[PDB]
Amino acid sequence: ELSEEDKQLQDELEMLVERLGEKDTSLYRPALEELRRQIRSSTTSMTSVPKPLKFLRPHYGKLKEIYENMAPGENKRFAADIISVLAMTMSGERECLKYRLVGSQEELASWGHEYVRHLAGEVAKEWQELDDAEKVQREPLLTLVKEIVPYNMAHNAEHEACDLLMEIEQVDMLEKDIDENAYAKVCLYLTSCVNYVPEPENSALLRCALGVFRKFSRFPEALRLALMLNDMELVEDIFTSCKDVVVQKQMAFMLGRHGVFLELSEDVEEYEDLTEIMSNVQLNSNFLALARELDIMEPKVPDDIYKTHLENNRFGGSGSQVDSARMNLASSFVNGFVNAAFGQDKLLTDDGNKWLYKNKDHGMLSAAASLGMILLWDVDGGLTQIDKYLYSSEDYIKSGALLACGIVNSGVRNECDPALALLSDYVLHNSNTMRLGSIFGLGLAYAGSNREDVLTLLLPVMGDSKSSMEVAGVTALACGMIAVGSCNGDVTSTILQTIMEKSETELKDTYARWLPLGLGLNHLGKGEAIEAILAALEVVSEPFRSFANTLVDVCAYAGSGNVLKVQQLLHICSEHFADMGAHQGVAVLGIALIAMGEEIGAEMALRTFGHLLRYGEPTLRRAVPLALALISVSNPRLNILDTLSKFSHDADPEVSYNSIFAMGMVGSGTNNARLAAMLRQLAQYHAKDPNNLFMVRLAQGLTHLGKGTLTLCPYHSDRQLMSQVAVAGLLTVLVSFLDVRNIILGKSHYVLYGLVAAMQPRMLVTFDEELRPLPVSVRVGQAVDVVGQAGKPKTITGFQTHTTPVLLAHGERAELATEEFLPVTPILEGFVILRKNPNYDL
Amino acid sequence: IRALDEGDIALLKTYGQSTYSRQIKQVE
Amino acid sequence: VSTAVLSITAKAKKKEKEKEKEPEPNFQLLDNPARVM
Amino acid sequence: SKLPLVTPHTQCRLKLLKLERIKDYLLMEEEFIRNQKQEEERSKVDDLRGTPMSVGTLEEIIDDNHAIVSTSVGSEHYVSILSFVDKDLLEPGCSVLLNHKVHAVIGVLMDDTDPLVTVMKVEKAPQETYADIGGLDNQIQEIKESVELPLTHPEYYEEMGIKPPKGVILYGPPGTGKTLLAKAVANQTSATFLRVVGSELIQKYLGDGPKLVRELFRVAEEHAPSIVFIDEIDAIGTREIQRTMLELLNQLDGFDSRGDVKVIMATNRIETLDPALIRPGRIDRKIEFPLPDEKTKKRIFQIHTSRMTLADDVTLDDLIMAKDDLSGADIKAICTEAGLMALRERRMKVTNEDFKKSKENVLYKKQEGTP
Amino acid sequence: IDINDVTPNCRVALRNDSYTLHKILPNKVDPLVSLMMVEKVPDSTYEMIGG
Ligand SMILES: Nc1ncnc2c1ncn2[C@@H]1O[C@H](COP(=O)(O)OP(=O)(O)O)[C@@H](O)[C@H]1O
The finding on whether D300 has its CB within 6 A of some atom of ligand 1 is yes
Helix (H) or strand (E) holding A132: none
Q: Cβ separation of B8 and A54 shorter than 8 Å?
A: yes
Question: What is the whole-number distance in angstroms between the Cα of residue D332 and the centre of ligand 1?
Answer: 9
D348 CB within 8 Å of a chain B CB = yes
- Asked whether the beta carbons of D51 and D72 are under 8 A apart, the reply is no
DSSP state, A298?
S
At D172, the amino acid letter reads G
The finding on whether D267 has its CB within 6 A of some atom of ligand 1 is no
Q: Residue A48: closest CA among chain B residues belongs to which residue?
A: B12
Range 3-32 of D in CB contact (< 8 A) with C: 20, 23-24, 27-28, 30-31
Show residues of chain C in contact with D15, CB under 8 Å: none
Show residues of chain D in contact with B15, CB under 8 Å: 348
The finding on whether D128 has its CB within 6 A of some atom of ligand 1 is no
CA atoms within 13 A on the CB side of E19: 7
Q: At a CB cut-off of 8 Å and minimum separation 6, what does A402 contact? A: A390, A422, A423, A426, A434, A437, A438, A441
Show residues of chain D in contact with C10, CB under 8 Å: none
Angle between helix A599-615 and A582-595 (nearest 10): 160
Counts for chain B of helices (H) and strands (E), in that order: 2, 0
A75-93 per-residue burial string, b: 16 or more CB within 10 A, e: under 16:
bbbbbbbbbbbbbbbbebb
Question: What is the whole-number distance in angstroms between the Cα of residue D174 and the centre of ligand 1?
Answer: 8
Show residues of chain B in contact with A49, CB under 8 Å: 8, 11-12, 15
Q: At a CB cut-off of 8 Å and minimum separation 6, what does A421 contact? A: none
Nearest to A823 by CA among A782, A762, A760, A779: A779
Nearest to A494 by CA among A462, A465, A522, A530: A462
D302 CB within 8 Å of a chain A CB = yes
Show residues of chain D in contact with C1, CB under 8 Å: 31, 34-35
Show residues of chain B in contact with D15, CB under 8 Å: 20, 24
Q: Cβ separation of C5 and A567 shorter than 8 Å?
A: yes
Going from the C-alpha of D275 to that of each of A4, A542, D169, D262, D287, the distances in angstroms are 68, 78, 13, 20, 17
Residue A24 — φ and ψ, nearest 5°? Answer: -55, 135
Question: Among D28, D141, D347, whose Cβ lies nearest the Cβ of A566?
Answer: D28
C5, C9, C11, best to mutate vs chain D, most D CBs in 10 Å: C5
| C-alpha to C-alpha distance for A187 and A204, rounded to whole angstroms | 13
The finding on whether D266 has its CB within 6 A of some atom of ligand 1 is yes
Q: At a CB cut-off of 8 Å and minimum separation 6, what does E5 contact? A: E24
Q: What is the DSSP string of A68-131?
A: HHS-TTHHHHHHHHHHHHHHTTTT-HHHHHHHHHHS----GGGT-HHHHHHHHHHHHHHHHHS-
The finding on whether D278 has its CB within 6 A of some atom of ligand 1 is no
D49, D51, D53, best to mutate vs chain E, most E CBs in 10 Å: D51
**Distance to chain D for C1, nearest Cα, Å:** 7
User: A19: exposed, middle or buried (C-beta count within 10 Å: 0-12, 13-18, 19+)?
Assistant: middle
Q: Cβ separation of D20 and C8 shorter than 8 Å?
A: yes
At D79, the amino acid letter reads V
Question: Among A49, A53, A118, whose Cβ lies nearest the Cβ of B19?
Answer: A118
D24 CB within 8 Å of a chain B CB = no
Q: Cβ separation of A198 and C9 shorter than 8 Å?
A: no
A292 CB within 8 Å of a chain D CB = no
Quick one: how far is CA A513 from the chain centroid?
A: 25
Show residues of chain C in contact with A604, CB under 8 Å: none
User: E23: exposed, middle or buried (C-beta count within 10 Å: 0-12, 13-18, 19+)?
Assistant: exposed
Q: Cβ separation of D346 and B8 shorter than 8 Å?
A: yes
- Asked whether the beta carbons of D26 and A608 are under 8 A apart, the reply is no
CB atoms within 10 A of CB A363: 24
At A301, the amino acid letter reads V
**Distance to chain A for D4, nearest Cα, Å:** 6
Sign of the alpha-carbon dihedral angle for A475, A477, A482, A485: positive
Residue E22 — φ and ψ, nearest 5°? Answer: -95, -65
Over A37-58, what HEC string results? HHHHHHHHCCCCCCHHHHHCCC
Quick one: how far is CA A193 from the chain centroid?
A: 14
Range 2-21 of B in CB contact (< 8 A) with A: 2, 7-8, 11-12, 14-16, 18-20
Question: What is the whole-number distance in angstroms between the Cα of residue D310 and the centre of ligand 1?
Answer: 23
E19 CB within 8 Å of a chain D CB = yes
CB atoms within 10 A of CB E7: 9
Question: Among B20, B21, B27, whose Cβ lies nearest the Cβ of D20?
Answer: B27
The finding on whether D198 has its CB within 6 A of some atom of ligand 1 is no
Nearest to D195 by CA among D255, D119, D249: D119
Q: Cβ separation of C3 and D35 shorter than 8 Å?
A: no
- Asked whether the beta carbons of A249 and A279 are under 8 A apart, the reply is no
- Which residues of D contribute to the annotated binding site for ATP? 172-179
Q: Cβ separation of D31 and C3 shorter than 8 Å?
A: yes
Residue D251 — φ and ψ, nearest 5°? Answer: -60, -30
The finding on whether D179 has its CB within 6 A of some atom of ligand 1 is yes
Q: Whose CA is nearest to atom 26 of ligand 1?
A: D329
Quick one: how far is CA A739 from the chain centroid?
A: 27
Interchain touch A–D (≥3 Cβ pairs closer than 8 Å): yes
CA atoms within 13 A on the CB side of A806: 21
- Which residues of D contribute to the annotated binding site? 172-179
Question: What is the whole-number distance in angstroms between the Cα of residue D342 and the centre of ligand 1?
Answer: 24
C8 CB within 8 Å of a chain A CB = yes
In this structure, the dihedral spanned by the alpha carbons of residues D228, D232, D236 and D238, taken in order and rounded to 10 degrees, is 130
**Distance to chain A for D140, nearest Cα, Å:** 6
Q: Cβ separation of C5 and D24 shorter than 8 Å?
A: yes
- Give the pairing of strands D66-70 and D76-80: antiparallel
Nearest to A238 by CA among A195, A266, A209: A209
Question: Among A189, A561, A570, whose Cβ lies nearest the Cβ of D28?
Answer: A570
In this structure, the dihedral spanned by the alpha carbons of residues D10, D13, D18 and D23, taken in order and rounded to 10 degrees, is 120
- Asked whether the beta carbons of D25 and A608 are under 8 A apart, the reply is yes
| C-alpha to C-alpha distance for A495 and A548, rounded to whole angstroms | 12
The finding on whether D298 has its CB within 6 A of some atom of ligand 1 is no
Which of ligand 1's atoms lies nearest the C-alpha of D181? 18
Interchain touch A–E (≥3 Cβ pairs closer than 8 Å): no
D115 CB within 8 Å of a chain E CB = no
The finding on whether D237 has its CB within 6 A of some atom of ligand 1 is no
| C-alpha to C-alpha distance for A97 and D56, rounded to whole angstroms | 73
CB atoms within 10 A of CB E20: 10
Show residues of chain E in contact with D51, CB under 8 Å: 18-20
| C-alpha to C-alpha distance for A169 and D358, rounded to whole angstroms | 45
In this structure, the dihedral spanned by the alpha carbons of residues A326, A332, A334 and A340, taken in order and rounded to 10 degrees, is -160
